[PDB]
Write a protein that binds this ligand. Sequence first.
Ligand SMILES: Nc1ncnc2c1ncn2[C@@H]1O[C@H](COP(=O)(O)OP(=O)(O)OC[C@H]2O[C@@H](O)[C@H](O)[C@@H]2O)[C@@H](O)[C@H]1O
Length: 160
Amino acid sequence: APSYHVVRGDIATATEGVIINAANSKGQPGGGVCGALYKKFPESFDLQPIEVGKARLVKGAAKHIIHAVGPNFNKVSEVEGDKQLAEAYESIAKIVNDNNYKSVAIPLLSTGIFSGNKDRLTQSLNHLLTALDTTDADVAIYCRDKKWEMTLKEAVARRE
Ligand SMILES: Nc1ncnc2c1ncn2[C@@H]1O[C@H](COP(=O)(O)OP(=O)(O)OC[C@H]2O[C@@H](O)[C@H](O)[C@@H]2O)[C@@H](O)[C@H]1O
């Protein structure tokens, strides 16, 4: 194991430049993080349809970016959506192992508006961590606000 750590900043400025997007399974995009990555990595996206909880690793004019399906959690069951939120991180962890991504800038998956329209940060960190229990990659885990920042440590402080 390396380390895993909460970082208050922007993922669309991360040095690793391996980043995740909240794609939907249609490939059709839109978002905060997603529209910040467009201001870093336009010549870097292939926008395909993707399977639910799966990914597409894209190669571009400076870095490689991973599109992944964050399902809208108001459409799925909680125990089922929780199974898909493990799978979405596990199916990413496979790719972070295979393509040898020894450090990565990783966001939250579909935990905000794309949840049940409400914040599930700590449950999404448990699933980020539960996919990473079978990995040896170092983890820049981003946030914007100091309550959300404190929530990502609070989620690690349920597994310390
Ligand atoms: N640039 C950023 N870098 C890292 N983390 C960020 C960033 N901007 C926002 N976040 C964090 O992610 C959460 C917000 O996610 P989005 O930015 O909205 O993620 P995105 O992939 O773009 O989701 C798109 C969905 O949300 C809305 O932006 C939009 O309506 C769309 O339905 C917050 O908890 C915040 O801490």
